[PDB]
Design a protein around this ligand. Structure first.
Ligand SMILES: COc1ccc2ncc(F)c(C[C@H](O)[C@]34CC[C@](NCc5ccc6c(n5)NC(=O)CO6)(CC3)CO4)c2n1
Ligand SMILES: [Mn+2]
Ligand SMILES: [Mn+2]
Lengths: 670, 672
DNA sequence: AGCCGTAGGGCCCTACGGCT
DNA sequence: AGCCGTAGGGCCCTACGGC
């Protein structure tokens, strides 16, 4: 992998460490091949702080660096046997590049500490504004970053060693709480000391993963990748009435315009939203192989096609009506939504799961009818308890159905935001004839791989870890649904074999609820009431802003129509005014003066076509106006009374509940 | 990789062979898990007719098939050991799916012949209009292709065994001539199944598709479908040299979606090549980021790169909007695409072409644009111009990598027959380096030669004592210096002797084997330099003739509209009252038409007229446009009435392109 | 040989948290 | 131990023809 230099005098030789071959190519073209070597790594390197020594010494990327430096590791480390006097870390000018830098400084600190001590370790500084060095032209990477005449390099300096020893243990170690504490105390919503560098770069990454990757927003229940996918579909008119659009086009559009990450991350997020076993209310409607419950992946994006589901329209409803705030995209060239209008409670409906830095999230799916009735009960009573809300919201409702054992785990999860929810498969004991029996599984727990589960039972039987099982078959079909058959030995108690399967296999899986969502852009552990309160505050805002916008637009349009009506009342005069004018400026000024018209009104008259002078067209102008006057009155009523605004929110949620609300799938047992 | 069925009774068991995991998923979801098994392959299978046994037996896909069937192969073939009584070939409903089918049948016929004799081999029939079984929903697949209650399976039948051996030999064999002769004899340009008929039809659909729609360039624009689709793709989305760079993935996805139903790398890599100044004599793509090197390094992932048209590409696309070329329906009928680009410069000869098809291959070298244009101007003035007179203009190929060409001999043979071997030599010098010692400095290498790989080949000869006198070898190439390969010479060793050996033993000297095959009326044809130029000129004459014809239609329509607005402004008051007293737009139309002697288009142009057109400046503006239009109409009719005038217009336009884009010759033709 | 360039097709290593 | 889901990064087999 190493693209070495001509020279063999380490004192003048430099080694540049890059993320992969895309950045490597630009680097090999722009460099000085006499004194500058290039080692392209393969993305994220191993965390030596969290890893076992054997794993470290056998890792291909760790080995490639050891071999290239020629200094050996730990105690056998000889700074004399070094092949470069500058080890230059040149990761990409993004948050994951900062993370790879922290992962590298950690390996150098725990294994090659004298390399830092000798001042041999540097950090390159490529221009921000690129996603990778592979986006840069060789001449651009050279002058800015690699030429010793123009480059700005940071030399890594280890000042206090005990402070550094505590830093690497805090940020890179296996104890989460210390990292969480560090993020909480520090989050904000030339030589360089290693401790400062590790703290600033790790906080850059942690923060970014927390607010812009792994955690959902409380208002719409979406993570940046899902929001950008849905918006991408909205922008391209990939609505349910239109035909399916190729996945490659959606992925490429979303990536180019909103998501500066790999295709794999975008396509896989899109695929999951299109799976009925993953989403309680699927957001994407996919044509083709979108994977299975057996862990089978979707077909490559060239084969599949997609569009929004009917319910996705409710997530994007009124986005163009000044309901939500837009922000600049990653490069300034595009505008993206900060949140979606979310006309149905998506956070609780589809749930969420995401591994962040210092924290994680695990919100289960819920039944739409129960959520809406929950939100409606809350609208009528701000003081409602979790117990009362539970009269509406019984508990989670998995797309895979099954059983939940007891309401105590649910109660605790809705009150504290944390709890263990015991899930069970739908299994029954039935006869197969000849005095023999079988166990028939028709519903498996949520997020459990059906094939992998069957293989675990197979494994237990083969290893004689369970008694009574004579056969095991997956009789699932498009036609009969999920059907897993476990044949029992004649005279053996099948209820005992079933109880054993529940203790030994994923046939019984628990769901550890950990309700962390972004509230006002900060991660917060929330309870059931809080999740709903935030959803309702959001809906009141969306509806109010839509009404304020529709009113501004209706007034602007009534204004224009008042001008067209004046023109229809004085057509000969209007014509004479335009005809007697040499320019469009003169006509516009003369019209404004003669008929007390605004600039907007006179431009509208000047833009009016001759076909608009016929009987039908004259009528259309009068009818649009009379309709709009009534519409302005209707809107002005909504903004004059807060109880009328709140009742519209309730009426709109009621319509959604009546159209999209479905039956409970998951049975809650006592 | 096999997803077997639960039943262990071969009689009721079926095995489906699919192209990969994308098709497998859809297949696995729709099937009857009790009776149907799925084996997903990994694309194109090995051709057993062209392979030796060590290779056949080491192949993962071949191995996976033998194991799943359990019958064994050749002499040890046992039909009783068959785990399935139905081996169903289920490749995608595309040309490549037909090729994979011929590849699978060749293996079954050569290694598992009794399995065909027994009637255990069948061919599935999925619907077309899908990109792969991975595009179909599971329920759709079961109904149309897998359900025994509704499917239509062809059972492979071996009729005449002597006839089959020859069909497998001719089509899949190592001798290219018999295969080429089969395509020449059978090509047409512009239930049980007989193995021979299946092989002949599927292989011919594949062969014809690679020839007319993949590997060979069109004589008129010099482009292959992928490149023409990329360039049309950029044109549609306005990714011109004046606009900013657009994301590589957005281009790739758009082109794949709308025009090219093929894999992503194929699109991106064709776009990358068109952007490389060492690949293209006149690059067609302007790229931002890592687009590869002469060292065989590939481009950065498409997520990193940005692209747009070069100024020269605007000349390839110039007049596409003006009815010059025939548009055709795309692969799925939802879009329209050009069959050929107007190509205002001779692209086939300028950038060359390199392609491996079925039964043939093409190898066309790049040329200097100033020379080519001068050659076309010469042929326009003299239809009977000889190849010898053309060579006064077109000296020989002119590589983007410069270098040297040894003699006019190979060039002359290639330009007269379309076939010749042209010796390409590196630009190499012998210079002193101090201490009474010398070195060989290489600054230009031959075309399509990987620099790093050539250096590795020289290093190899030195390590393996096959060359004497070399002491060191370095690549000193930089953005500052340009290509610079340094070979150190041992003190007192003859440096020219070392150099002459390096030419004889390494890519330092390479041969360009000219084989000028291009599509002519959609048919592969071996053309010489004159025929290439003749076909280019005729295409240009038609492009200009059609553009002229289009503008004349456009102007005459415009003049007719203006005649109506002229009448409307001369009677504005009666025009307004006519419209004011009309209940509907249709009534106004009919009224303006009868009263003022207007046509449907004229009456509609008046009804669409905005009130601002009634200002004083407008009636004068209209009479100005109408009068400059009459002059314009006259000019166009003059061009279309005299062919000499039309030909002079072609000459003029090519002379401009020559003065705007013509560059100096890079490659030196040394008389050796 | 093994390369040239458009085509078919897919796999595996890393981080990060909380649960088992 | 290892699985869940957004992220960093890349490789290798096959057909085809002409030297
Ligand atoms: C797969 O099975 C294997 C097996 C082994 C492999 N070993 C190494 C290796 F690097 C890869 C991956 C391969 O290198 C790629 C990487 C990204 C990939 N999509 C890019 C993209 C990004 C953005 C896009 C589109 N495509 N397509 C579009 O149409 C527009 O948007 C193109 C190449 C998909 O696979 C392997 N893949
Ligand atoms: Mn990166
Ligand atoms: Mn295919």
């Amino acid at each position: 992998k190493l693209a070495d230099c001509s020279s063999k005098s380490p004192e003048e030789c430099e080694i540049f460490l890059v993320e992969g071959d895309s950045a490597g190519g630009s680097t090999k073209s722009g460099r000085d091949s006499r004194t500058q070597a290039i080692l392209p790594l393969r993305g994220k390197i191993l965390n030596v702080e969290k890893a076992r020594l054997d794993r470290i010494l056998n890792n291909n990327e760790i080995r490639q660096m050891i071999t290239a430096f020629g200094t050996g590791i730990g105690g056998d480390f000889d700074l004399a046997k070094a092949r470069y006097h500058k080890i230059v870390i040149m990761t990409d000018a993004d948050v994951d590049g900062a993370h790879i830098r922290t992962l590298l400084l950690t390996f150098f600190y725990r294994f090659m500490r004298p390399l830092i001590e000798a001042g041999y370790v540097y950090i390159a500084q490529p221009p921000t504004g690129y996603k990778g060095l592979g986006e840069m032209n060789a001449d651009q990477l050279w002058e800015t970053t690699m030429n010793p005449e123009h480059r700005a390099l940071l030399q890594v300096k280890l000042e206090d060693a005990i402070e550094a020893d505590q830093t690497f243990e805090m940020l890179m170690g296996d104890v989460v709480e210390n990292r969480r504490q560090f993020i909480e105390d520090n989050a904000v919503y030339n030589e360089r000391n290693i401790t400062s560098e590790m703290r600033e770069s790790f906080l850059d990454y942690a923060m970014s993963v927390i607010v812009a990757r792994a955690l959902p927003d409380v208002r719409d229940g979406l993570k940046p990748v899902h929001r950008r996918i849905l918006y991408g579909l909205n922008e391209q008119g990939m609505t349910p009435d239109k035909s399916y659009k190729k996945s490659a086009r959606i992925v490429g559009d979303v990536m180019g315009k909103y998501h500066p990450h790999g295709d794999s991350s975008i396509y896989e997020a899109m695929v999951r939203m299109a799976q009925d076993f993953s989403y309680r209310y699927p957001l994407v409607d996919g044509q083709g192989n979108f994977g299975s419950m057996d862990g089978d992946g979707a077909a490559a994006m060239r084969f599949t096609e997609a569009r929004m589901t009917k319910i996705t329209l409710e997530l994007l409803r009124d986005i163009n009506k000044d309901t939500i705030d837009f922000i600049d995209n990653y490069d300034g060239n595009e505008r993206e939504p900060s949140v979606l209008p979310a006309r149905f409670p998506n956070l609780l409906a589809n749930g969420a799961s995401g591994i962040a830095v210092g924290m994680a999230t695990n919100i289960p799916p819920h039944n739409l009818t129960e959520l809406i009735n929950g939100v409606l009960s809350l609208s009528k009573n701000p003081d409602i308890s979790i117990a009362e809300l539970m009269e509406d919201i019984e508990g989670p409702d998995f797309p895979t159905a099954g059983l939940i054992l007891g309401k105590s785990g649910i109660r605790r999860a809705y009150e504290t935001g944390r709890g263990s929810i015991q899930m069970r498969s739908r299994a029954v004991i039935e006869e197969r004839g000849g005095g023999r029996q079988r166990i028939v599984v028709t519903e498996i727990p949520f997020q459990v791989n059906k094939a992998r589960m069957i293989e675990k039972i197979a494994e237990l039987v083969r290893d004689k870890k369970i008694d009574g099982i004579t056969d095991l078959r997956d009789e699932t079909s498009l036609r009969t649904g999920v059907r897993v058959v476990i044949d029992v030995r004649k005279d053996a108690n099948a209820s005992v074999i079933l109880n054993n399967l529940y203790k030994q296999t994923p046939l019984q899986t628990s769901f550890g609820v950990n309700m962390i969502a972004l509230v006002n852009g900060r991660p917060k552990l929330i309870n059931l009431k809080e999740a709903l309160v935030h959803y309702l505050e959001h809906q009141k805002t969306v509806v109010r802003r839509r009404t304020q916008y529709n009113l501004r637009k209706a007034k602007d349009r009534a204004h224009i129509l008042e001008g067209l009506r004046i023109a229809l009342d004085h057509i000969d005069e209007i014509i004479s005014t335009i005809r007697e004018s040499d320019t469009d400026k003169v006509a516009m000024e003369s019209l404004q003066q003669r008929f007390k018209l605004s600039e907007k009104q006179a431009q509208a008259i000047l833009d009016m076509r001759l076909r608009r002078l016929t009987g039908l067209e004259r009528d259309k102008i009068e009818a649009e106006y009379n309709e709009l006057l009534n519409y302005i009155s209707e809107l002005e009523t909504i903004l004059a009374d807060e109880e009328v605004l709140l009742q519209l929110v309730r009426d709109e949620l009621t319509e959604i509940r009546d159209r999209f609300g479905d039956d409970r799938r998951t049975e809650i047992q006592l």
